[PDB]
Write a protein that binds this ligand. Structure first.
Ligand SMILES: [Zn+2]
Ligand SMILES: [Zn+2]
Lengths: 286, 286
């Protein structure tokens, strides 16, 4: 089920060792060999790992079973933050700004910093295009998919992509660095993550689809006329009422369990939800 | 049910007109009559209203029924923020600091500001001790109960509570203003709200109690030996399997619906959950 196809391990590893390795380390600057580097979104990127790592190691048990009845919502939650807040807002240490005053133009910023071994990384892209494998091999219910924090925390598209002496003087970041955030942050986490997130409100019961599937599977048994109601949600959950809305509308006998249970069972299709549950109603809302 | 006892209206009003009135306005300073006042946690307190107001006006329908299947989790969510973040962290614009350097001591802060008509408010306490009525008349599933943002956004316990010439020179805020945050913020939202919040992971299935009640009600019908399983959560939700784990362990007939439905029904006790649902199992996990 989750060897590959489900959160089983696929969702176990990435930002649980994408981070335990790539940006566990990559730099030995201002200390031994004292050339300047102010970027330590490294220890800042480290919160990101342990965070997710442990958090997903909790998106992940049968529960505090009693209390935490049966969880991992957890992730969707630990997405909500990363998203809207703390990225998709990590955007806002540049919405625009430095474009007009004596800053990006002819003087202040198109000169300083010809000491760049920042190219040391951008290799790291390796372990986004691995977080990328995680994606639909199974979304860590897309919780990994804060990844794109990296798919833009590896957006040195000014750095190692300069318009050095061809047309743009110091307008190198005024674009090909400004929109960067805008439509890959606002319309990133500050929707995306800000969403699976927001269905931390269980709802979206489903995508009309397995909605569809679901129904037609149940609609079609021996446990026929008597489909009453689906309701649905994340990591699994479905449920419900049916049986004989033609006569076995009391008539039958509890044999006619497994029959639902057949149904239920037959709502395998997925990998799964619960024994997303049947109340097996005889007598008819008509 | 919710006239008074449930979120019906009680949860409709407070921070949906606690804020629409109290700090809709209270001040006309630097403009007409130009005495100084830098505090506009007023327009900042206004986000707080509309926010909650509208949000609770959504903690509150049958759903985007299809998608948002049947919601209001919403609040618990809109608590999570207020809490841990954006208060219980609004604490940290003072953990301590101004205690030692020439700031609170003999010179800088125990002198400036003898112009205080800040006493204009502290009346506002009126509409916390109304948010206080909201509490258990029904917790707006304690979402209102970000209120205590006010129960500490009305913590002028330096202001209009000075140790002016009795023992403490300028040590007036170094205490009776420092701990203020600590153990009414950290151990406030940054647990409290940071919690109902975190059970945005449905879980806490319940408080062993109505857990208890629940069970013994079901345990005790004509729908006897055959209690299988509770599972539980917020605004209502319960569910489950039972019937005849002594013989009507297939034997009976779907008459024996309402019998669960009796049960279910009889899990009135609360105001309620769902028709927190029964799968009525004959043949026995034994
Ligand atoms: Zn029924
Ligand atoms: Zn069963």
């Amino acid at each position: 089920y989750g060897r590959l196809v489900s959160r089983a391990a696929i969702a176990a590893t990435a930002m649980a060792s994408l981070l335990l390795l790539i940006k566990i380390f990559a730099w030995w600057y201002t200390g031994s060999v004292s050339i300047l580097a102010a970027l330590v979104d490294s220890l800042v990127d480290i919160g990101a790992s342990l965070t997710n790592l442990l958090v997903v190691r909790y998106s992940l048990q049968p529960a505090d079973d009693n209390h935490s009845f049966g969880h991992g919502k957890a992730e969707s939650l630990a997405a909500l933050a990363q998203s809207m807040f703390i990225s998709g807002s990590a955007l806002f240490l540049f919405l625009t700004g430095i474009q007009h005053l004596i800053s990006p133009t002819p003087m202040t910023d198109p000169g300083v910093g010809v000491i760049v071994t920042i190219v040391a990384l951008i290799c790291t892209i390796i372990l986004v295009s691995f977080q990328r494998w995680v994606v639909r091999r199974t979304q860590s219910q897309a919780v990994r998919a804060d990844m794109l924090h990296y798919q833009s925390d590896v957006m040195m598209n000014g750095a190692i992509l300069l318009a050095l002496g061809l047309s743009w003087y110091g307008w190198h970041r005024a674009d090909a660095l400004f929109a960067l955030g805008i439509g890959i942050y606002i319309l990133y986490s500050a929707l995306r993550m800000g969403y699976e997130a927001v269905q931390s409100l269980l709802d979206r019961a489903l995508p009309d689809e397995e909605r569809q599937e679901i129904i037609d599977i149940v609609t079609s048994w021996p446990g026929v006329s008597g489909a009453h109601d689906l309701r649905t949600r994340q990591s699994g959950p479905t449920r419900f009422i049916q049986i004989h809305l033609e006569m076995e509308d009391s008539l039958p006998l509890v044999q006619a369990h497994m029959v639902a249970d057949q149904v239920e069972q037959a709502i395998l299709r997925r990998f799964p939800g619960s024994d997303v549950i049947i109340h097996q109603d005889p007598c008819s809302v008509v």
